[PDB]
């Protein structure tokens, strides 16, 4: 995880990487906030 | 026909979505995901 070059090296299981383009991992946008949306009802259920 | 569409499927995201528990369970099967990604990449290069 140090840098893309080291990620490429560690994906190929080798300390030397030849000329070319290598698929290493995937970029993904992490979420920022948690949103909960429940109905406006408040009357408790008659479980008792 | 000369070539077909070059497709690539992320094995981890397809099998497990964005769940870390599923990824940890997926690691129990070895390197299946690596083999599948490798084969698809080889097909993609062969099209060019
Ligand atoms: C079974 O019944 C008990 C007792 O309830 C009492 O008698 C019943 C037949 C009804 O007439 C009830 O209206 C009456 O209270 C239930 O216990 C009661 O539960 C309510 C709801 O949580 C309690 O109310 C709360 O009390 C706390 C502390 O006093 C305060 O934050 C508020 O007053 C809040 O509303 C109430 O105190 C409690 N009553 C007794 C006597 O403890 C019980 O819930 C029910 N069983 C089940 C499964 O729900
Ligand atoms: C919740 O209740 C009604 C719908 O039942 C809605 O119009 C109202 O704005 C809501 N109130 C709050 C405080 O969000």
Swiss-Prot record, chain A:
Where do the record's region annotations for Disordered lie?
Answer: 28-44
Its recorded name reads Spike protein S1
Q: Which residues of the full protein are shown?
A: 292 to 339 of 1273
* Positions bearing carbohydrate: 32, 34, 40
Oligomeric and partner information: Binds to host ACE2. RBD also interacts with the N-linked glycan on 'Asn-90' of ACE2. Cleavage of S generates a polybasic C-terminal sequence on S1 that binds to host Neuropilin-1 (NRP1) and Neuropilin-2 (NRP2) receptors. Interacts with host integrin alpha-5/beta-1 (ITGA5:ITGB1) and with ACE2 in complex with integrin alpha-5/beta-1 (ITGA5:ITGB1). May interact via cytoplasmic c-terminus with M protein. May interact (via N-terminus) with host bilirubin and biliverdin, thereby preventing antibody binding to the SARS-CoV-2 spike NTD via an allosteric mechanism.
So what does mutating residue 48 to D actually do?
Answer: In strain: Omicron/BA.1, Omicron/BA.2, Omicron/BA.2.12.1, Omicron/BA.4, Omicron/BA.5, Omicron/BQ.1.1
- Write the gene name: S
The protein's job, in short, is: Attaches the virion to the cell membrane by interacting with host receptor, initiating the infection. The major receptor is host ACE2. When S2/S2' has been cleaved, binding to the receptor triggers direct fusion at the cell membrane. When S2/S2' has not been cleaved, binding to the receptor results in internalization of the virus by endocytosis using host TFRC and GRM2 and leading to fusion of the virion membrane with the host endosomal membrane. Alternatively, may use NRP1/NRP2 and integrin as entry receptors.
Altering residue 48 to H: what's the impact? Answer: In strain: Omicron/BA.2.75, Omicron/XBB.1.5, Omicron/EG.5.1
């Amino acid at each position: 995880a140090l840098d893309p070059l080291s990620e490429t090296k560690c994906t190929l299981k080798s300390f030397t990487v030849e000329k070319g383009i290598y698929q290493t991992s995937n970029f993904r946008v992490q979420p920022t906030e948690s949103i909960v949306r429940f109905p406006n009802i408040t009357n408790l259920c008659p479980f008792g | 026909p000369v070539s077909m569409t070059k497709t690539s499927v992320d094995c981890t995201m397809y099998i497990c979505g964005d769940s870390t528990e599923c990824s940890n369970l997926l690691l129990q099967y070895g390197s299946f995901c690596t083999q599948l990604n490798r084969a698809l990449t080889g097909i993609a290069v062969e099209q060019d």
